[PDB]
Amino acid sequence: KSHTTCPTSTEIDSCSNDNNACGKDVSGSCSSLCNCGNGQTCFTDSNHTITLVPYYTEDGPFEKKYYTCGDPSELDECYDIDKALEVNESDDPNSVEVLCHCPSDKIYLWIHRGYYICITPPQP
Numbered sequence: 001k002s003h004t005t006c007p008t009s010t011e012i013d014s015c016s017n018d019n020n021a022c023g024k025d026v027s028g029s030c031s032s033l034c035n036c037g038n039g040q041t042c043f044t045d046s047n048h049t050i051t052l053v054p055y056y057t058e059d060g061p062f063e064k065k066y067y068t069c070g071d072p073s074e075l076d077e078c079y080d081i082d083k084a085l086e087v088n089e090s091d092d093p094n095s096v097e098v099l100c101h102c103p104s105d106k107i108y109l110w111i112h113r114g115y116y117i118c119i120t121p122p123q124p
Contacts, residue, residue: 005041005043005044006023006030006032006041006042006043007032007041008032008035008039008040008041009032012032012033012034012035013034013035014034014035014036014037014038014039015034015035015036015069015095017070017097018036018037018069018070019068019069019070019072019075019097019098019099020034020036020068020069020070020095020096020097020098021050021066021067021068021069021096021097021098022034022035022036022042022045022067022068022069022096023042023043023045023066023067024064024065024066024067024092024094025064025065030042030043033094033095034094034095036069036070037069040069042067042069043067045067045068045069046067048067048068048069048071048072049065049066049067049068050065050066050067050068050102050108051063051064051065051066051104051107051108051121052064052065052066052085052107052108052116053107053108053109053110053121054090054091054110055110056124060123060124061107061121061124063107063121066096068096068098070098072098072100072101072102073101074101075098075100075101076100076101077100077101077102077103077118078099078100078101078102078117078118079118080117080118080119080120081117081119082117082118083099083115083117084099084100084102084108084115084116084117084118085097085098085099085102085108085115085116085117085118086099086115086116087115087116090110090114090116100118102118103118105120106118106119106120106121107119107120107121109121
């Protein structure tokens, strides 16, 4: 009653891999980008939310939240400078695949290579 899961969209299908990320904060409403598993909500993956920084601003780092499925807690940790996250686009990735585990003390930073790396967020 106080809280409820978000509904699933019928315009999305299950992802091939369960380690894909889904959902994003756009209007404050929970958007659905891909169904996880047989059709699980991305709301329950709130506890597995990750921080992705697509770009920096004058005010500071822009942290964008993304929800991931598969619970990559048992996944290996990536190095600070190495392939860690593969996304379709750096601006609005509707497809994000978890390749490795990133700690909550690190963010995904887009680099000139064209992919995101797992690194501790520096204070500008």
